[PDB]
């Protein structure tokens, strides 16, 4: 059950795969680094037309929800 941590690692890679060159800021927590990449990616994908408005909106709202859960307790 060092799997609490293997699961976060696994998820983290989905934001920063070994073969990205946009590397996360070192002094950042895993959570803010991921959200922050999720935002920059939602903007890019929405420009390129990879995702639509509804899809863009939801991702953005999940991100503000995540930020609240960091900025408390």
């Amino acid at each position: 059950d060092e799997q609490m941590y293997q699961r976060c690692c696994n998820l983290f890679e989905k934001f920063f795969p070994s073969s990205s060159y946009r590397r996360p800021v070192g002094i950042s927590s895993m959570v803010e680094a991921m959200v922050s990449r999720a935002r920059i990616d939602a903007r890019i994908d929405f420009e390129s037309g990879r995702i639509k408005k509804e899809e863009f909106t939801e991702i953005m709202k999940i991100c503000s929800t995540i930020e609240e859960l960091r900025r408390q307790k």
Binding site: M4, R7, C8, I59
Partner: protein
């Protein structure tokens, strides 16, 4: 794809053990942990 990943983050952030990790482990620390797996 983008949707699956942010929904799993929201989930992991929903449970106190994984929340704590994801908040208090910095990117720099992941490398310190990896070296002692």
């Amino acid at each position: 794809g983008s949707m699956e990943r942010i929904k799993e983050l929201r989930n992991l952030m929903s449970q106190s053990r994984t929340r704590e990790i994801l908040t208090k482990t910095t990117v720099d620390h992941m490398a310190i942990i990896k070296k002692y797996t």
